């Protein structure tokens, strides 16, 4: 019997965990009990996604979650997948990772980082919450905006003239409650699941970064499994990914109504000022990655539709 482990930053209330439960359910079903997957949420295995991805390389951890743009830590050119206002929708994201650039990235992740991408899911589009109303770009000036330890999110806070305040995901609620920070930044689904709306009187539809979610498996783990069970793992992830995608999609259809009923004021500021403010980070990306970065942008821009 194969007792596998899956770690994640998301809590048990979030859609990521719900889809992971389906993943474990499919694994046990399609393997006739040979494969049993235990879930380890709330980042109880490591600091963040970066720590758990490193655990997959060593084979200590079998499965974990990761955004495609998060691979920029290992392959700098992959940051194009998480550049602010670069990805339009999930259909664009699906096609963006299926470019020659996207396919080469996953291939490099396999060859050099010991991780195999099983499936891709939609993990929501990020918005901005605050204790004060954000109706223009000037309203975010000097606010202590919490962001994850990622360059794209840090840049978004910086070029909106906010004060980038990086901290762990588990420490966000308390920080908002005690007004240590003035606001955070996450998809609507995450905002509801982690109940950030309980401590945030405002919500700005900024739509700056789209998050996908990759079902990663350790290369060592796949090597320890019979070939037919490796196919089970692949198929189980694809099933969960669809369920994963549908969860975020369904909520984003009616979550704005939910928040407004809870007394949260939802603003929809003009985003052409937001998009224009992100230009120096694009220059930053290009200067760091050179022609590789330029061609990557033009390749992903082409499949936006
Ligand atoms: C797979 C994964 O760990 N996603 C996490 C992301 C990424 O760490 C970040 O976007 C960088 O890619 O940040 C969070 O949204 C956050 O801290 O607010 C939590 C979320 O669980």
Numbering used by the authors: 3 to 307
Task: Give the published text.
The first step of this process is the transport of sialic acid to the cytoplasm, which often takes place using a tripartite ATP-independent transport system consisting of a periplasmic binding protein and a membrane transporter. In this paper, the structural characterization of periplasmic binding proteins from the pathogenic bacteria Fusobacterium nucleatum, Pasteurella multocida and Vibrio cholerae and their thermodynamic characterization are reported. The structure and the thermodynamics of the binding of sugars suggest that all of these proteins have a very well conserved binding pocket and similar binding affinities. While the C1 carboxylate has been identified as the primary binding site, a second conserved hydrogen-bonding network is involved in the initiation and stabilization of the conformational states.
Pm-SiaP and Fn-SiaP were crystallized together with Neu5Ac. Their structures were determined to 1.57 and 2.5 Å resolution, respectively. The structure of Pm-SiaP was refined to an R factor of 0.17 and a free R factor of 0.20, and that of Fn-SiaP was refined to an R factor of 0.21 and a free R factor of 0.25. All three proteins (Pm-SiaP, Fn-SiaP and Hi-SiaP) have very similar structures, distinguished by two domains on either side of a well defined pocket, within which Neu5Ac binds. In all of the Neu5Ac-bound structures, a consistent pattern was seen in how Neu5Ac interacts with four of the residues within the pocket. Using Fn-SiaP as an example, Arg126 interacts with one of the O atoms of the carboxylate group at the C1 position and the O2 of Neu5Ac to form a second salt bridge. Asn186 interacts with O2 of Neu5Ac, and Asp50 interacts with O7. Similar inter­actions between these four residues and Neu5Ac exist in Hi-SiaP and Pm-SiaP, with minor differences in sequence numbering (e.g. Arg127 and Arg147 are involved in the first two interactions in Hi-SiaP), as also seen previously. There was one interaction seen in Hi-SiaP (between Asn10 and O10 of Neu5Ac) that was not evident in Fn-SiaP and Pm-SiaP. The binding affinities of Fn-SiaP and Pm-SiaP to Neu5Ac are 45.5 and 19.7 nM, respectively.
